[PDB]
Amino acid sequence: ARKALIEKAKRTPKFKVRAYTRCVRCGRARSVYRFFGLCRICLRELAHKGQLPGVRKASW
């Protein structure tokens, strides 16, 4: 049970409870961000790459 999984989260099934964020890049269910569409890993890779608009290493 893996790639079939990412497909199963696409078309929205019987009840709306069954809604769960997966992520676009990796099929990761765990630690997906709503704002990015991303997991915490994928998020990191992209941010560091400079591909996330106005996203910067924080530091205060």
Asked if 57 is part of the footprint of other proteins (rule: CB under 8 A), the reply reads yes
- Token pair 């994928």: residue: 42
The verdict on whether residue 40 carries a ligand-binding annotation is: no
Distance of closest approach, residue 9 Cβ to Zn ion, in angstroms: 12
Question: How many CB atoms are located within 10 Å of the residue 21 CB?
Answer: 15
Mention every residue, 6+ apart, whose C-beta is less than 8 A from residue 20: 9, 29
Distance CA 39, CA 47 (A): 12
Asked if 24 is part of the footprint of RNA (rule: CB under 7 A), the reply reads no
Asked if 55 is part of the footprint of RNA (rule: CB under 7 A), the reply reads no
Distance of closest approach, residue 39 Cβ to RNA, in angstroms: 6
Asked if 28 is part of the footprint of RNA (rule: CB under 7 A), the reply reads yes
